[PDB]
């Protein structure tokens, strides 16, 4: 081939070029490194520029009568080797030296413009050097925001969109779909750092702000990658933005597939949204959705046939002879397969456009009209800079205009990954000219029910909650409502102090309010009914008192005892009247004057019944000799002697228990929510049993001595009533034991009340009532 | 002043004006640095042992910050007449100068290096710090005489460790400086157990300009975020000429209380220092480079308008960077002396290509003002740093040393005393969560590790700080613990003891009962002829008395440690006797009424039917049920002793035989109650109408004694009395048996030994018919 000999053609105005034609596989001397390995992309782009220049020369409307030329070169993606040809371009015409002056306007450059490099790293280096001389430089691949500044790069233009537009579109998509809680990751190159720097401000200015901002280490021949993902998984975010080159994304996804990570919506850049490496990773289908933005642009349609024809021509021995009439000495031995890999690359057009732009500018500065145009002194490089701003130049029937910053405007398309088998496919669901336009019914998400994934925060906690601030830049809040055991004292100072001891407060309470003393009151529905029964209880007891003291001398009452019967009868009424001391507001006196003043009369009366029972036992069982002696003894003051003995025992027992464990008033708070309970407290059955000892013993001693006596033949017996009366006492006090321990606490004072009222009622219906009934009918009986 | 001819020349790039190059405000820093360079050159000329004969010159040029960077380099690289040949091998290019003392700003340094790399022309910088400048692949001919930024970050972190601070805020400017420094600080902090509350970007601005409302809103929001968090240590990475507006905004509010960790950029600046109202915001600590007094320099410097204005300030400060230029110049001089091979008093002139000087510069080693000047493989000289506190009173200097930093050791040292702003000169406190008390575990809250909550553990669990502090391990074995107890106090069990009074009370009640039966046993035996003994059915009565002695002989199995050997008897032996004891009384009641009632009411078959199948077999069937129900009970349950927890206090526990549960206790008190009631009904039927030998009376009596004990036990057990279940059951067990010992035979003992009214054979023969 003779390709390498077609990199310099003459003309009235010559362009310069810088492409990565070759690659190179410790500096001790000042020598330029040598690159040998062949890269086809640089050759393809150089041939694209050659096509553009030939096409311009052929036409007649553009630069009619003038012939363009070019001078291509190699950069090796290394500043050291890319600086030398740059130093060459700005040199005295027809000379090999460069002159140092105080300013421009004293130079005679041997080129008119430069089609800059494909790399931002070299773009930054060469732009500063060029800007001193005001030599216009048009780049076809450099996409970095830092190059838009006009204070450091006055004479820089690019025909590829900057990285700001893609991030703005991503932010608008995030906002429209409603995603406030996100996580941002970027590579460890200048790429990722600049991307994060732009996106942080763009998001913070729209309501989105990030949960974590991290960098993914580059695969420079693994441990840190573990840490990065742990933080992401620890924030509960369903959306992740990845702004990284291809290698970092490949490493990250390989690691993620190796282990298990829950699927998430990944928002990509153009680096790895169309890379076969990532698409071909096994297991990639188990990570979730993949969206992105891809630019729209025409593609040259005659480039393949052009390169075929020119390669065939170079094969011609005759042409090489005429051609003679090395920047890249390694591209002379290549074949069609060495370049067929990328004859559809989407950047030849860019180079094409670049060249056209420069040409048009010249056409405008020379003031050329249709076919011929004025003769003047040659145009200087720094003159073109005035016509390049706001320049509408047509390429491939697509109008294009430069801006103040030197960028061009292009649209975008929203690409989504769809799986059909194991081969991903790219589908379009959106558009972005200046405002996003999205379609929502053509998306297939990764959730079970095909529903939009959700990632949101809260920016205002509702009144009644404590807010914990979360976020990298401290935007969002986590709202928590403390339970029903504390207040919300202040909006800040995140803590819910516990309520006061007297205070009650529910959940979500600004303050805890006071409570109410709780005790069975006198007007409670239960108390009235127990008091209504008291009226009947007193009523019937007195009537028996109205009878016994009336027929005192009758033979029937005489057998009962007469005066002895009354003393028991009156005593019963007193204990009945001792039923009112319990309810109401406790008082120290009524607490200590409740038990001992209630059971004392009972033992004062159960002696009366016992005297009768023992009387029946003397005759029914004992021998005659003892029967006569006891009959003449118990009939006398012995009856009152026993009563005094029982009274002395009861008081002594009560005094012992009184000192042993005197009941006291206690206040219970936590038993019920909104009422502090004050009530008199006892000690197990120790006090109960001690006070119950006497009447328990005397009642039993009555039962055994009169349960067995035979019924009188054809006449009322004096043993039946006592036997039936005593079993009434036993069941009442036996029956209420399970109750008093298995009822509501507040009603505990209200059950002790019943036991006496039910106890007394049975006695009046067992031993005294039968005498009253016969006495009422005594006049009619005889 | 900017020119001096000599055999060898040197370059210089300082920024005299920074705010054509002569159109901005003056900067005296450039002037005194240039004067330092000139003084170094003249001093090296004066001496007669460093370079004999060989003179030195200089060629200085302004740079005007990042405005002018290309022209000076082209100027330096030119043979003469401003012509620079272009070729492919510069091994024989004699450039105008021999070395360049590079510029101050990092970006200009990088720009100049990217040009000078082709010719390998040594360049020493003196004020640019950035880790990116340590890459010798990109920059093969760049050296530095000050440490990099990681050392600054290390000093900051060691300061934050010496005093306990683990909750800080970070503010950064919008440029490469702030972004890089903040990222580096975050990476460092992530590995040292320190937290960052949040981060923010200050809007980029300049003094003497008008700002928009949006930027004021941004500053207001930033200051509010500052005055809402609990962190009180703020680290600022930004350059001067931007912080005036921020500090004015913070002063407008009432934000007081913070430690402001500055950086090299504004750690020493007079214009911001002069703001008097700034005094009352907290302590101001900065990181700077140690100063080295240079003998015989003020005479050269003093001997222009701006220099006199701040001459007092240039006396107090300004001696922190001149040593860098001094050392760089002397390093170049020593490298040149070594390369030429000169001696104490002899020299030999020779062409010197710049690329040769680099090899000798890389290996210089000498002492200057008691400091060793040698270059590390990354192109650095290790000079000590300082931490400087800002002092306001004008008596002493405005920047006071508080500590020293040694790059070759990565350690803070010689920490002096600092005047804080707290009430009683205490160390300002900065922490997220308070330390936990004893025994409490950690409940995480949030994403930061250093924030947490204190949770108290419940009884039965202990917290081993030697192990996971986020969860307390459950106390295993018999050990027990309660709230806030890392150590347990293993518990205790009890059983019916000896000294306990209730046990003694049961002992006396049982003993007198046992003695009564034995006295009856001799009495019912030696009187085998009287009808009373024969009226009891015969030897059958004796079988009944004996089985009662065993029962009371089974009182002591209830006292002692509980185990299977004794738990078996308590379940099988004790209740076996009871059912038969009542049954013999029940079948006895069958004799009293039925034997003559049905023999007179159903004589058709009853007379002969019961003649052969006496009452003995009927009792046996009742027994046969007793074994069947018993064996079923043992199979349904187990013989393993049961353990329980005492509600009175955890330290006590209870062990007892399996039937201790009332449900199991009632297992055998069902047929026994049935046998009791049927016997009671029959006895009452023949209460007094028959007078066989006055046996119905007693049977009803002893039956009543049994019933009251049974009903009393159940009712009381419906309430429970702590550790009393064992004693109450024993008291009932001894009581119910006593109902038999002194309620069935005791009275019959009386008749035999007191009244012969029944012993006479004639009398009993009379009552038998009746």
UniProtKB/Swiss-Prot annotation, chain A:
It holds the Pfam family ANF_receptor. GO terms for biological process: detection of chemical stimulus involved in sensory perception of sweet taste; G protein-coupled receptor signaling pathway; sensory perception of sweet taste; sensory perception of umami taste. Changing residue 495 to T/S/E/V: Abolished the response to brazzein. It is a multi-pass membrane protein. Residues 1-528, 583-597, 662-687, 742-747 are extracellular. It is found in: Cell membrane. One of its GO terms (molecular function) is G protein-coupled receptor activity. Coiled coil: none annotated. The chain crosses the membrane at residues 529-549, 562-582, 598-618, 641-661, 688-708, 721-741, 748-768. InterPro entries: ANF_lig-bd_rcpt (IPR001828), GPCR_3 (IPR000337), GPCR_3_9-Cys_dom (IPR011500), GPCR_3_9-Cys_sf (IPR038550), GPCR_3_C (IPR017978), GPCR_3_Ca_sens_rcpt-rel (IPR000068), GPCR_3_CS (IPR017979), Peripla_BP_I (IPR028082). GO terms for cellular component: Golgi apparatus; membrane; plasma membrane; sweet taste receptor complex. Glycans are attached at residues 58, 103, 233, 254, 338, 369, 390, 433. Keywords: Cell membrane, G-protein coupled receptor, Glycoprotein, Membrane, Receptor, Sensory transduction, Signal, Taste, Transducer, Transmembrane, Transmembrane helix. Residues 550-561, 619-640, 709-720 are cytoplasmic. Residues 494-503 are annotated as: Required for brazzein responsiveness. SUPFAM superfamilies: Periplasmic binding protein-like I. It comes from the Eukaryota. Forms homodimers or heterodimers with TAS1R1 and TAS1R2. Putative taste receptor. TAS1R1/TAS1R3 responds to the umami taste stimulus (the taste of monosodium glutamate). TAS1R2/TAS1R3 recognizes diverse natural and synthetic sweeteners. TAS1R3 is essential for the recognition and response to the disaccharide trehalose. Sequence differences within and between species can significantly influence the selectivity and specificity of taste responses. Belongs to the G-protein coupled receptor 3 family. TAS1R subfamily. This is Taste receptor type 1 member 3. The gene is TAS1R3.
Curated annotation (Swiss-Prot), chain B:
One of its GO terms (biological process) is G protein-coupled receptor signaling pathway. CDD domains: 7tmC_TAS1R2, PBP1_taste_receptor. It is found in: Cell membrane. Its main location: membrane. The keyword Zinc-finger does not apply. Pfam families: 7tm_3, ANF_receptor, NCD3G. Glycans are attached at residues 46, 210, 254, 274, 305, 365, 424, 464. The chain crosses the membrane at residues 504-524, 540-560, 573-593, 619-639, 665-685, 698-718, 722-742. GO terms for cellular component: membrane; plasma membrane; receptor complex; sweet taste receptor complex. One of its GO terms (molecular function) is G protein-coupled receptor activity. It is a multi-pass membrane protein. Residues 525-539, 594-618, 686-697, 743-770 are cytoplasmic. Keywords: Cell membrane, G-protein coupled receptor, Glycoprotein, Membrane, Receptor, Sensory transduction, Signal, Taste, Transducer, Transmembrane, Transmembrane helix. SUPFAM superfamilies: Periplasmic binding protein-like I. PANTHER family: CALCIUM-SENSING RECEPTOR-RELATED, TASTE RECEPTOR TYPE 1 MEMBER 2. Forms heterodimers with TAS1R3. Putative taste receptor. TAS1R2/TAS1R3 recognizes diverse natural and synthetic sweeteners. Belongs to the G-protein coupled receptor 3 family. TAS1R subfamily. This is Taste receptor type 1 member 2. It comes from Homo sapiens (Human).
């Amino acid at each position: 081939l003779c390709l390498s000999q077609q990199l310099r053609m003459k003309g009235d105005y010559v362009l310069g070029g810088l492409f990565p034609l070759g690659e190179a596989e410790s500096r001790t001397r000042p020598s330029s490194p040598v690159c040998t390995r062949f890269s086809s992309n640089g050759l393809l782009w150089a041939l694209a520029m050659k096509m553009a220049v030939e096409e311009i020369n052929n036409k007649s409307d553009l630069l009619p009568g003038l012939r363009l030329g070019y001078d291509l070169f190699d950069t090796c993606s290394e500043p050291v080797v890319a600086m030398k040809p740059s130093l060459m371009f700005l040199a005295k015409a027809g000379s090999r030296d460069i002159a140092a002056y105080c300013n421009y306007t004293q130079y005679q450059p041997r080129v008119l413009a430069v089609i800059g490099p494909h790399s931002s790293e070299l773009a930054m280096v060469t732009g500063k050097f060029f800007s001193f001389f005001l030599m216009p430089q048009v780049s076809y691949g450099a996409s970095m925001e830092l190059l838009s500044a006009r204070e450091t790069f006055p004479s820089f233009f690019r025909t590829v969109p900057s990285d700001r537009v893609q991030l703005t579109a991503a932010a608008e998509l995030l906002q429209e779909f409603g995603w406030n809680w996100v996580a941002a990751l970027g590579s460890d190159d200048e790429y990722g750092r600049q991307g994060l720097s732009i996106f942080s401000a763009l998001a913070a200015a729209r309501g989105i702000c990030i949960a974590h901002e991290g960098l993914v280490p580059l695969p420079r021949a693994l441990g840190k990658v573990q840490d990065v993902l742990h933080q992401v998984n620890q924030s509960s975010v369903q959306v992740v933005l990845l702004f990284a080159s291809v290698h970092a994304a490949h490493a990250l996804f390989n690691y993620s597939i190796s282990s298990r990570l829950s699927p998430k919506v990944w928002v990509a850049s153009e680096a790895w949204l169309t890379s076969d490496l990532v698409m071909g990773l096994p297991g990639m289908a188990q990570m979730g959705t993949v969206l992105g933005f891809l630019q729209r642009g025409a593609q040259l349609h005659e480039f393949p046939q052009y390169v075929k024809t020119h390669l065939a021509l170079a094969t011609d021995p005759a042409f090489c002879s005429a051609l003679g009439e090395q920047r890249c000495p390694q591209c002379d031995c290549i074949t069609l397969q060495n370049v067929s890999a990328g004859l559809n690359h989407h950047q030849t057009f860019s180079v094409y456009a670049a060249v056209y732009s420069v040409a048009q500018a010249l056409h405008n500065t020379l003031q050329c009209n249709a076919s011929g145009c004025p003769a003047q002194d040659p145009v200087k490089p720094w003159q073109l800079l005035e016509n390049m701003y706001n320049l509408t130049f047509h390429v491939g029937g697509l109008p294009l205009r430069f801006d103040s910053s030197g960028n061009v405007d292009m649209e975008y398309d929203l690409k989504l990954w769809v799986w059909q088998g194991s081969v991903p496919r790219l589908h379009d669901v959106g558009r972005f000219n200046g405002s996003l336009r999205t379609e929502r019914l053509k998306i297939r998400w990764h959730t079970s029910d095909n529903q939009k994934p959700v990632s949101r925060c809260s920016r205002q906690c509702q009144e009644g909650q404590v807010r914990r601030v979360k976020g990298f830049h401290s935007c969002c809040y986590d709202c928590v409502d403390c339970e029903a055991g504390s207040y919300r004292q202040n909006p800040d100072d995140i803590a819910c102090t516990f309520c006061g001891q007297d205070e009650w407060s529910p959940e979500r309470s600004t303050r805890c309010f006071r409570r109410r003393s709780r005790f069975l009151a006198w007007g409670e529905p239960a108390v009235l009914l127990l008091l209504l029964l008291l009226s009947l209880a007193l009523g019937l007891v007195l009537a028996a008192l109205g009878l016994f003291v009336h027929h005192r001398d009758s033979p029937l009452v005489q057998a009962s005892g007469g005066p002895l019967a009354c003393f028991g009868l009156v005593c019963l009424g007193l204990v009945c009247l001792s039923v009112l001391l319990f309810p109401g507001q406790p008082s120290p006196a009524r607490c200590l004057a409740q038990q001992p003043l209630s059971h004392l009369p009972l033992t004062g009366c159960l002696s009366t019944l016992f005297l009768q029972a023992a009387e029946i036992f003397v005759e029914s069982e004992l021998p005659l000799s003892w029967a006569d002696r006891l009959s003449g003894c118990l009939r006398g003051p012995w009856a009152w002697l026993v009563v005094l003995l029982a009274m002395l025992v009861e008081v002594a027992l009560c005094t012992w228990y009184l000192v042993a464990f005197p009941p006291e008033v206690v206040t219970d708070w936590h038993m019920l929510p909104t009422e502090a309970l004050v009530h008199c407290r006892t000690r197990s059955w120790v006090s109960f049993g001690l006070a119950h000892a006497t009447n328990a013993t005397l009642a039993f001693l009555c039962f055994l001595g009169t349960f067995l006596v035979r019924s009188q033949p054809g006449c009322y017996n004096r043993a039946r009533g006592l036997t039936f009366a005593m079993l009434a006492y036993f069941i009442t006090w036996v029956s209420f034991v399970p109750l008093l321990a298995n009822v509501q606490v507040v009603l505990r004072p209200a059950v002790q009340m019943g036991a006496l009222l039910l106890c007394v009622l049975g006695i009046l219906a067992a031993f005294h009532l039968p005498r009253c009934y016969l006495l009422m009918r005594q006049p009619g009986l005889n | 002043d900017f020119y001096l001819p000599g055999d060898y020349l040197l370059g210089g790039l300082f920024s005299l004006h920074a705010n054509m190059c002569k159109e901005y405000e003056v900067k005296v820093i450039g002037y005194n640095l240039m004067q330092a360079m000139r003084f170094a050159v003249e001093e090296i000329n004066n001496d007669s042992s460093l370079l004999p004969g060989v003179l030195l010159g200089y060629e200085i040029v302004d740079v005007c910050y990042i405005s002018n960077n290309v022209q000076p380099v082209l100027y330096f690289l030119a043979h003469e007449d401003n012509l620079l040949p272009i070729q492919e091998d510069y091994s024989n290019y004699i450039s105008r100068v021999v070395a360049v003392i590079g510029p101050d700003n990092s970006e200009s340094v990088m720009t100049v290096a990217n040009f000078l790399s082709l010719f390998l022309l040594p360049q020493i910088t003196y004020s640019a710090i950035s880790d990116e400048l340590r890459d010798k692949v990109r920059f093969p001919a760049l050296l530095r005489t000050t440490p990099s930024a990681d050392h600054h970050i290390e000093a900051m972190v060691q300061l934050m460790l010496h005093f306990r601070w683990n909750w800080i805020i970070v503010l950064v400017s919008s440029d490469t400086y702030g972004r890089d420094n903040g990222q580096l600080l975050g990476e460092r902090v992530a590995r040292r157990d320190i937290c960052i509350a949040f981060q923010e970007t200050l809007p980029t601005l300049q003094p003497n300009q008008n700002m928009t409302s949006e930027e004021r809103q941004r500053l207001v929001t930033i200051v509010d975020k500052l005055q809402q968090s609990t962190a009180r240590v703020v680290v600022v990475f930004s350059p001067d000429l931007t912080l005036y507006h921020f500090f004015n905004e913070v002063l407008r509010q009432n934000f007081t209380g913070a430690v402001w960790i500055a950086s090299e950029s504004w750690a020493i600046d007079p214009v911001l220092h002069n703001l008097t109202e700034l005094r009352h915001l907290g302590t101001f600590l900065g990181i700077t480079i140690q100063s080295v007094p240079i003998p015989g320099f003020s005479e050269f410097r003093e001997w222009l308008n701006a220099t006199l204005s701040f001459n007092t300030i240039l006396r107090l400060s300004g001696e922190r960077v001149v040593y860098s230029v001094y050392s760089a110049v002397y390093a170049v001089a020593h490298a040149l002396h070594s390369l030429l091979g000169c001696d104490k008093s002899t020299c030999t002139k020779r062409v010197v290509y710049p690329w040769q000087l680099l090899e000798e510069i890389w290996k210089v080693n000498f002492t200057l003002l008691d400091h060793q000047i040698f270059f590390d493989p990354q192109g650095d000289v290790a000079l000590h740093l300082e931490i400087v506190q800002w002092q306001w009173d004008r008596s002493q200097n405005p920047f006071q040393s508080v500590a020293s930093y040694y790059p070759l050791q990565r350690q803070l040292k010689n920490i002096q005393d600092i005047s804080w702003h707290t009430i009683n000169n205490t160390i300002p406190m900065s922490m997220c969560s308070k330390r936990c008390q004893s025994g409490q575990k950690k409940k995480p809250v949030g994403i930061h590790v250093c924030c947490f909550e204190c949770i108290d553990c419940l009884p039965g669990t202990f917290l081993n700080h030697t192990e996971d502090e986020y969860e307390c391990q459950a106390c295993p074995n018999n050990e027990w613990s309660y709230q806030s107890e890392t150590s347990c106090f293993k518990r205790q069990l009890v059983f019916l003891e000896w000294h306990e009074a209730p046990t003694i009370a049961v002992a006396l009640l049982a003993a007198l009962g046992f003695l009564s039966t034995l006295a009856i046993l001799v009495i019912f035996w030696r009187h085998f002829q009287t009808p009373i003994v024969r009226s009891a059915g015969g030897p059958m009565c004796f079988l009944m008395l004996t089985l009662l002695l065993v029962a009371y002989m089974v009182v002591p199995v209830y006292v002692g440690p509980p185990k299977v050997s004794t738990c078996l008897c308590r379940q099988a032996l004790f209740p076996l006797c009871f059912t038969i004891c009542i049954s013999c009384i029940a079948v006895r009641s069958f004799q009293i009424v039925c034997a003559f009632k049905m023999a007179s009411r159903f004589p058709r078959a009853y007379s002969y039917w019961v003649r052969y199948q006496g009452p003995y077999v009927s009792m046996a069937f009742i027994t046969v049920l007793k074994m069947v129900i018993v064996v079923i009970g043992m199979l349904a349950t187990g013989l393993s002793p049961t353990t329980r927890t005492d509600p009175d206090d955890p330290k006590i526990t209870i062990v007892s035989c399996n039937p201790n549960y009332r449900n199991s206790l009632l297992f055998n008190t069902s047929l026994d109650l049935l046998l009791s009631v049927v016997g009671f009904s029959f006895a009452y039927m023949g209460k007094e109408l028959p007078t066989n030998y006055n046996e119905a009376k007693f049977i009803t009596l002893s039956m009543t004694f049994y019933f009251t004990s049974s009903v009393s036990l159940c009712t009381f057990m419906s309430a429970y009395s702590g550790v009393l279940v064992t004693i109450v059951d024993l008291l009932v067990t001894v009581l119910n048996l006593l109902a038999i010992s002194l309620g069935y035979f005791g009275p019959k003992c009386y008749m035999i030994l007191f009244y012969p009214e029944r012993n006479t054979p004639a009398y009993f023969n009379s009552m038998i018919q009746g």
